[PDB]
Structures are given as C-alpha cells and as structure tokens.
Design an enzyme around this catalytic site. Structure first.
Site, short mmCIF file in Angstrom:
data_model
loop_
_atom_site.label_atom_id
_atom_site.label_comp_id
_atom_site.label_asym_id
_atom_site.label_seq_id
_atom_site.Cartn_x
_atom_site.Cartn_y
_atom_site.Cartn_z
N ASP A 1 -40.16 -23.67 5.95
CA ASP A 1 -38.95 -24.08 6.97
C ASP A 1 -37.72 -24.10 6.62
OD1 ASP A 1 -37.68 -25.60 8.80
OD2 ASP A 1 -38.67 -27.42 8.50
N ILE B 1 -51.33 -25.49 16.12
CA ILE B 1 -51.64 -26.08 14.83
C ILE B 1 -50.33 -26.76 14.46
CG2 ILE B 1 -53.21 -24.24 14.13
CD1 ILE B 1 -51.00 -22.83 12.32
N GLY C 1 -43.06 -27.24 15.01
CA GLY C 1 -41.99 -27.08 14.07
C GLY C 1 -40.65 -27.47 14.34
N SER C 2 -39.69 -26.83 13.60
CA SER C 2 -38.38 -27.74 13.93
C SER C 2 -37.74 -27.25 15.32
CB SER C 2 -37.36 -27.34 12.89
OG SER C 2 -37.35 -27.97 11.71
N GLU D 1 -43.31 -25.08 19.06
CA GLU D 1 -44.74 -25.12 18.33
C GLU D 1 -45.05 -23.92 17.67
OE1 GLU D 1 -46.26 -25.84 22.41
OE2 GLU D 1 -46.44 -27.88 21.77
N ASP E 1 -33.78 -28.31 2.16
CA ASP E 1 -34.79 -29.31 2.81
C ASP E 1 -35.98 -29.18 2.19
OD1 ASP E 1 -35.28 -31.36 4.88
OD2 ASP E 1 -36.03 -29.87 6.22
N1 LIG Z 1 -46.73 -24.74 9.87
C1 LIG Z 1 -47.57 -23.61 9.41
N2 LIG Z 1 -48.86 -23.90 9.23
C2 LIG Z 1 -49.74 -22.73 8.79
N3 LIG Z 1 -49.27 -21.67 8.02
C3 LIG Z 1 -47.87 -21.67 8.42
N4 LIG Z 1 -47.04 -20.72 7.93
C4 LIG Z 1 -45.64 -21.00 8.11
N5 LIG Z 1 -45.47 -22.30 8.57
C5 LIG Z 1 -46.86 -22.57 8.68
#
Ligand SMILES: Nc1ncnc2[nH]cnc12
EC number: 2.7.11.1
Length: 287
Positions: free
Chosen positions: A150, A18, A21-22, A25, A132
């Site tokens: 984050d 979905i 991330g930093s 994934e 951030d």
């Molecule tokens: N990137 C994300 N998408 C959906 N729920 C999350 N909870 C934490 N990070 C998330």
C-alpha cells in the site's frame, strides 16, 4: 508512467474479488504465461478524481521498487476506463488479520518486525518513506514471507527535497512531526514502526478507542506511548527507542535490525505458517 502497457487480458486472467484497496477493488488473477497467481488492483479512472494524484504516485513508487520485502509490481495496464495494477499475490493475510484470533508470542512479533525493518531499510536507502506503516499494510505469503504493501501515500526524497511536509497516514500511527506538518523524513516511519510493535504486542495501537481527530492533538501533546504489560525488557526497550518525540534520536531501520529484541527472538519466517494456519482455522469457524 513511461512504461504503461495495454491489453492486460491478453496476458492475465481476472478472477474473483479478494478485497477493497485504497482506490478501488483487489482481485485475484492468473499470469497466463506462468500460471502463477497475481493480485490485480482495478481502479475506475472515471470515478477517480483528485485521487489520481496518489494513484499515479502509487504506480511510480511500486515500479521503482525491487525488493523481496516490498510487494512486487508486474505492471500497469490500461483497459477502457480502468487501470489494472498487477502485483505479487500474497495469500497468508495481513499481519492485522493474523492478530484476530488472539495474541502473538514474542518470537512471532520479532520475526514480523525484522522483516518489516528489512523493507524499511530498502525503502529508506532508496529515499522513499512509506508513511502508512501499520499491521494492515504488512502482508504475508502462505509460507510466511512478509512484505510491505500500500504505497498510495508514499513520499520520495530527492537531492532538492530532503524532507516532506504532507499530512498523510493513519492517525493512530502517525508521527508527531507529521501531524504538525513539520519537515520530516524516514524517521517518521520509525515512529510508525514503534506503534506497529505495540499493535503486534497488544492487538491495537495506543488510543485506538478514541475518535481519530482527538488523537491529532493527543499525539503531539502527550509523552510518547510505551509498551505496558508483561513483555520482555528488550521488547519494551525496542518500542521506547522508536517512540522518541525527537526524530533525530530515533534509530534507523538498519540500527534496529541489530536490536537485542530482534537478535534474541526473531526466527525463520517459515514458522509464521503456524499463525497463518491459526487464522484460517479461526476464520472457518467464525460464526
Ligand atoms: N490485497 C492483496 N491481497 C493479496 N495479495 C496482494 N498483493 C498486493 N496487495 C494484495
């Protein structure tokens, strides 16, 4: 990581990707005990190098937070060469996503800002600095609840370290004292909040069309940004209060929750479902 767990697949099911991330994934998942959906950030430790420092900080900080305004942490699980960080799933999109279809109105801006401020007040009271703050890191549930996310570059103050000096954040949102690497504290997040208010009002932070290295000299040199356009006086004044070059003159999060802009305009978070639905409709028709 005195509480790292193991064998996550015995308690969670990993579903589809979905996002990114930093540090790897993000996947949707299911808690097999409650059947609630969760988010699982999977980081390849083999690949991770010096990032491990921040990945370690992210988990530490998530694990120490317990607030309805901060993404909940379920745990970190070790699996082969992967670390699974299991968190609260938020299906409404980020505030940045929600700006894609078009402008927000002042009630939506105030509602989102009020919730962000509750999260900042929590973090700051715990001696944590997010570092951030920007619309991309403000996530919503499908029913409109708003949480900060984050924590990869978050800072922790302690009795022996009352200020931080690290250069971290996203340039357009960084406070001038963070760019200068001066000794700073939670007031750096208040400047970032001011920039985020302009972002929620205009769609983008000041200087967004410039290369980020350029803003590193523009932010410390120039007068602070102001909110230009036909916006209410309390919104413009909210932005100005946050964007003071002297950190000690910026109000605290607790003080901003009493600002006229917030008191006059913030409404129930449930009404934000209209914005979440607008994004789903817009995304569906996007060619
Ligand atoms: N990137 C994300 N998408 C959906 N729920 C999350 N909870 C934490 N990070 C998330």
């Amino acid at each position: 990581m005195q509480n790292l767990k193991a064998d996550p697949e015995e308690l969670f099911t990993k579903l589809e990707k979905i996002g990114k991330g930093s540090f790897g994934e993000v996947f949707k998942g299911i808690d097999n005990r409650t059947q609630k959906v969760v988010a699982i950030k999977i980081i390849d430790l083999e690949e991770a190098e010096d990032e491990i420092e921040d990945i370690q900080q992210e988990i530490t900080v998530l694990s120490q937070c317990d607030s309805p305004y901060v993404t909940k942490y379920y745990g970190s699980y070790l699996k082969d060469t992967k670390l699974w960080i299991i968190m609260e799933y938020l299906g409404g999109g980020s505030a940045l996503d929600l700006l894609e279809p078009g402008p927000l109105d002042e009630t939506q801006i105030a509602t989102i800002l009020r919730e962000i401020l509750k999260g900042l007040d929590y973090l700051h009271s715990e001696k944590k600095i997010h570092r951030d703050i920007k619309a991309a890191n403000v996530l919503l549930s499908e029913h409109g609840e708003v949480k900060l996310a984050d924590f990869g570059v978050a800072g922790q103050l302690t009795d022996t370290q009352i200020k931080r000096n690290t250069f971290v954040g996203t340039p357009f949102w960084m406070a001038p004292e963070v760019i200068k690497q001066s000794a700073y504290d939670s007031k750096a997040d208040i400047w970032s909040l001011g920039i985020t208010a302009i972002e929620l009002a205009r769609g983008e932070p000041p200087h967004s069309e410039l290369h980020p290295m350029k803003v590193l000299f523009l932010i410390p040199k120039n007068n602070p940004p102001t909110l230009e356009g036909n916006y209410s006086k309390p919104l413009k004044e909210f932005v100005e209060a946050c964007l003071n070059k002297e950190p000690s003159f910026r109000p605290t999060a607790k003080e901003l929750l009493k600002h006229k802009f917030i008191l006059r305009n913030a409404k129930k978070t449930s009404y934000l479902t209209e914005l979440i639905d607008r994004y789903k409709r817009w995304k569906a028709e996007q060619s």
